[PDB]
Write a protein that binds this ligand. Sequence first.
Ligand code: KC2
Ligand SMILES: CC1=C(C#C/C(C)=C/C=C/C(C)=C/C=C/C=C(C)/C=C/C=C(C)/C=C/[C@@]23O[C@]2(C)C[C@@H](O)CC3(C)C)C(C)(C)C[C@H](O)C1
Ligand SMILES: CC1=C(C#C/C(C)=C/C=C/C(C)=C/C=C/C=C(C)/C=C/C=C(C)/C=C/[C@@]23O[C@]2(C)C[C@@H](O)CC3(C)C)C(C)(C)C[C@H](O)C1
Ligand SMILES: CC1=C(C/C=C(\C)CCC[C@H](C)CCC[C@H](C)CCCC(C)C)C(=O)c2ccccc2C1=O
Ligand code: SF4
Ligand code: SF4
Lengths: 86, 665, 99, 184, 55, 177
Amino acid sequence: SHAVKIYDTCIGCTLCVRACPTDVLEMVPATVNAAKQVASSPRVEDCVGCKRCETACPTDFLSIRVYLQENEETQYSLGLDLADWS
Amino acid sequence: AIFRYVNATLWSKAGHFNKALSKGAKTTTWIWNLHASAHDFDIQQGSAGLIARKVFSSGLAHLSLVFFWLGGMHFHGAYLSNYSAWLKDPKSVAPSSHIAYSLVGQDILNSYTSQYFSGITITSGFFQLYRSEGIVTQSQLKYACAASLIATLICLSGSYLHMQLMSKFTSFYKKFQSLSQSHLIIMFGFGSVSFSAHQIHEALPINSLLDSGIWDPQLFSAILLGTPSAITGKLLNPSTGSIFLSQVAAHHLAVGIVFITLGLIKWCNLFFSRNAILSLRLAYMDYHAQLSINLAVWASLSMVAAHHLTEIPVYPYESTDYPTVLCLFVHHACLSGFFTVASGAHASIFVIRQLPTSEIRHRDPIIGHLIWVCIALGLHSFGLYCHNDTLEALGRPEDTFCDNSIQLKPIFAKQFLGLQPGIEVLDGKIVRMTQELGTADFMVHHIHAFTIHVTLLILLKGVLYARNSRLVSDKLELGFAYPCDGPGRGGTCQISPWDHLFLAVFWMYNCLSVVIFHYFWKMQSDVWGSYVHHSSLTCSHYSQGDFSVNSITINGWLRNLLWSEASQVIQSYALPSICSYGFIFLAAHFVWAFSLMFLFSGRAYWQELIESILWSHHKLKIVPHIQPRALSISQGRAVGLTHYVLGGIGCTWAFIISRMLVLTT
Amino acid sequence: DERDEGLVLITPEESGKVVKRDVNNNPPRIVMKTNDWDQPEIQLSTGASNQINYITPVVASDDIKAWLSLNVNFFSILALLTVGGIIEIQRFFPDTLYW
Amino acid sequence: LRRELAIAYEDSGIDLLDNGKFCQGLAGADGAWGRYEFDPLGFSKKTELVPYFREAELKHGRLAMLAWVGMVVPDFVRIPGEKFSFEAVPLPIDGHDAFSGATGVNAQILFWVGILEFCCAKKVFEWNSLEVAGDYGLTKFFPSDEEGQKKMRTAELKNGRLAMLAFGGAITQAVITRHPFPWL
Amino acid sequence: TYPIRNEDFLPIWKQQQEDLRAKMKEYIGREFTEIRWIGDYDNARSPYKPHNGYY
Amino acid sequence: GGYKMSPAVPFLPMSPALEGIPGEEEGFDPMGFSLAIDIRWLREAELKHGRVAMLATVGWIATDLGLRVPGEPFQVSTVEAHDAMVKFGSMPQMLVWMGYAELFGFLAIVNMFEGKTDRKPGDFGLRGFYPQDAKGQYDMQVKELRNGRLAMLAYGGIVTTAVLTQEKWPFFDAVVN
Ligand code: KC2
Ligand SMILES: CC1=C(C#C/C(C)=C/C=C/C(C)=C/C=C/C=C(C)/C=C/C=C(C)/C=C/[C@@]23O[C@]2(C)C[C@@H](O)CC3(C)C)C(C)(C)C[C@H](O)C1
Ligand SMILES: CC1=C(C#C/C(C)=C/C=C/C(C)=C/C=C/C=C(C)/C=C/C=C(C)/C=C/[C@@]23O[C@]2(C)C[C@@H](O)CC3(C)C)C(C)(C)C[C@H](O)C1
Ligand SMILES: CC1=C(C/C=C(\C)CCC[C@H](C)CCC[C@H](C)CCCC(C)C)C(=O)c2ccccc2C1=O
Ligand code: SF4
Ligand code: SF4
């Protein structure tokens, strides 16, 4: 699976969460920024690696980073449809 | 109707049409997007009425452009051409309405065409077209040019007017029954009848006099007079080597009558199976659906034109004007391919913007069987060539697929003309000769089928998997022209219908290049050439009939067609006639190679290089506020594709034209 | 707007209720908003009218100068003049015999 | 009554409601003893085009009235010219072919007729109405009474229709017989 | 060796074209004159005096 | 009283654009060109045509009568004078001068349309033999327009008849049949 990390530069605009195609991310309460919320990545097992969160991130450099891990590819991260590894 | 709203204020805005370009010129990507979306009237600011306005007015403006081009052709024929010398003696003098300057030694390009004329030999068949039309005087050509210019002005005025005449209530463009009926009865039926009238009343007497040898002004200013009972096409004009123009006029009269009859039976509702097409009628009332259908129709008609203009001779002396017939075939084949890939593109756009038909719901079997047929066709057809190569190299010709060895006879390729035995000749040239099909023709035709099927596979996959797929389920949300969906799910590069076209264009170009090479080599080896003396002639062909012996191997194609026949273009530098063709050969090679840059590289390298370069500009205080950017991914693909196709087409163009020009002169 | 000065421009609600003639003796004209940026308003006639409806566009020298000031026209004119100059130099002094 | 074109043009244009009369009450539908409303195919049901139909009918009638007399007179008399003489052109039906093309004799007629029609198109289209259909202001000799004007319009229409049929009859008979006036 | 298709017609075609040439020569009454590509010819039916012979 | 009818075509209403302009006494515009194009542009073009055609008519008449400027290159007929002088080099220089004068005319037209100057359509500021009274000025403008129109028609007739009959300007001793 890929690694989706969030950094404190986050401003809690929720655009990453809204752009998530498989609902990997969710906003959580925080005090670091004025919006009082920061995106989290609890369901990183479903991350496919499309980097749409990264596309939608406003900050100067991304407060959300998706690191691709081709060696640890799973069926959920590969979006397998015709074949099942479960 | 209100023309007070057309002002030049918007001319300097440069992006008013697209709302996404409101933040003008923050980067060079803005310039590129402006150009890319200039003519995408659907996504531009306004309404559906405005979209229709723009579509119709742009069609009229392009009509005016084409009329201007035709008028320029007529003017060049009238004033900058040797049409007089060609008309009196077509064989000796090559057509040339093209003259070059003497700027930098550039006068070398002009070549001997007549005693008093030096220029560039044209290959469009315009001289033969004029002769068929009966144009034999500079005054006639001048008035044709004047008519073309007047038509250009009229079309320009019509576009400008219709930009405001049509309002939001305008709906005449949605009256498909009226549109089709008018086009079928008037534009086609009445048009064909009127052109038959023109032929009968003007071209037939003039052409008959020209065939006889009469050049008298009074005569220039009794149908079926010379045509025997022989079936049309079974007997060519002995003095011209083309179908009788009276037969052509009768053809046009019959075609116009048939079109009028079809229109009238449709008017009376005689056609009954409306329900079988009602689904398409409801689904495909869209700009892009109609554009795709029309593009495919015109592509197929262009291919049929390419075949018939050569196989069936109708223009005077075009049969013996070998460069003309070859160039016509190649040009129309290329247009067929381009318009077919265009039809695929706009089918994909229609699927994206509108609801698709129900054949998309079993798309997996369709594309799966197409994939299988493509694989099997390619394997068998090309592996026969590879088998021939390997076995011949090993030294076992008896094991290869050829007429002498194992032979693949095209049993289904059967005659239908029923022509008499022999060939038709005209002044030391073979105007018409039957093409004899064998193993080489079998193999090359199956190669053609393979390439056509692979191009169709790419286009159909792009069309059917445009809305969604197993990989990505929101391709409809992504749109039509996007680079990818991301590096995820393994990587979603070129999943868009735009990229499917970007690949189908490569495959169409490959198919058309093979078709051009097949036609060129087969015609040179087995059809064209001269003859040496009931009389029996030994026919000396330009390529010496080597297609049937050498075309069975890829090495034979490489040696006897490319290397052997590139002698003219490769050795064209000193020759005044074709030095330009040699230089264009070289430059097209350069451009094709230069395209690989964009086809292989990626955006990020160039963006980083641009930033490193911009460091120095900033250091020296050269700050461009339209920040330089690397070309987008889709733009890089488009640029690479354009340069690739242009370079390949230029190499083929120069090679074939140089060969033909040198051989015929 | 000077073009429609003196014209009776009735809204669609007043159609047929107002029948006063224009300065040119024409009947009143119904004005409708189309919500089109290119043609914000369209006028229909209540009857036969004898009025001026210019088909020529309204072009200003300032607009033309701005269009030519657009970087494209500026640089295209610069490049065309440069190319013409080089071509004319080649014409007048061929082969660089002086060098 | 007939009002001056300036006043009549005040209410002009394509009407949308329909006066409930046969052909909007236009003249020319009147039998010898009673009323003859001839419209088997119901063309007059297009009340908006009715003024156009009357304008076209009057144009055809006037043109054919001229044409019939122009087919009759030439055989009896000709323009004093060598190319109009009976020897150069035997019958009027030959005039079209004799004077077509480079000679320009008929080209001039076509040119002037085209100029006149280009100038009259504005009335034909814009200023056409039930009352000004076929009215170019040439009202000299027009009676100053309602009944007189109606009768004169009826006479014009009847003679125009009679000549409209008579020109077809005469031209066809002349082409069939190649004979002088009596068969045309 | 390839025979020439429709050999028999060539003599016939030559005869037809020669016959048509003679017919038009007789019809005109004078020798055929080569047309001029850039020349101007008056119409035979023009009402004005000829400037250049209409033939 | 209804519409104001054109005196030229009594069965058509006068175009409102051609009211108050010299030459409105006739009020001739049946095709309605003044309803589609600016009357300022129309009158500017009409006056330019009239003046150019007057000069052309007088020049053609003079050359046909004779009166050729001293020199060998000018010993040609009026019909072929255009090509002869184009080859000679007179016509290119004349066209350069025309381009200069027409650049100034174009500036005048542009400024008039934009309203920078209160310039009448054909006015260039020349006041020679011009009556002081307004009625006289109107009459003189009408005289200019009518002479120019007559000159347009006269030049059309002169050039066409000259090319047809190959005769001199009067054409009286010409044969037509
Ligand atoms: C529906 C059946 C019908 C038929 C089949 C028929 C056939 C023919 C034929 C060919 C066989 C000719 C040649 C002919 C000729 C004329 N018909 Mg007639 N006609 C029919 C019906 C009426 C009616 C209802 C009226 C009428 C008239 C006239 C007038 C008078 C014109 C005038 O002087 O006003 C003329 C010249 C009107 C009238 O008043 O006749 C005294 C009139 O009211 N017709 N009619
Ligand atoms: C000479 C010539 C040329 C020509 C020509 C021209 C100008 C030809 C013109 C032909 C023309 C103008 C032909 C009219 C026909 C009218 C018909 C058939 C009317 C039938 C009418 C019928 C059948 C019935 C009518 C009525 O039933 C109705 C409707 C109601 C009833 O109450 C009354 C009656 C019964 C009467 C060229 C081309 C210019 C040059 C060339 O060189 C040769
Ligand atoms: C067609 C024809 C024929 C004819 C004819 C006809 C009717 C011909 C008509 C010709 C016609 C009508 C020709 C007018 C010319 C007027 C000119 C040149 C005026 C110049 C005026 C000038 C130069 C004025 C200049 C100034 O105003 C300026 C600019 C400002 C002020 O400083 C004042 C001055 C004065 C200095 C024939 C012969 C009858 C038969 C033949 O078969 C065919
Ligand atoms: C080279 C390259 C670039 C860099 C190329 C750029 C930025 C293009 C430069 C544009 C110039 C400024 C346009 C002007 C036209 C040429 C300079 C014209 C030269 C003409 C000669 C005859 C002199 C990309 O950005 C790119 C992006 C994605 C895939 C592949 C590539 C790619 O291959
Ligand atoms: S990851 Fe980016 S888009 Fe999401 S909350 Fe943080 S700053 Fe906003
Ligand atoms: S890469 Fe795509 S799937 Fe993974 S967290 Fe980001 S938006 Fe969601």
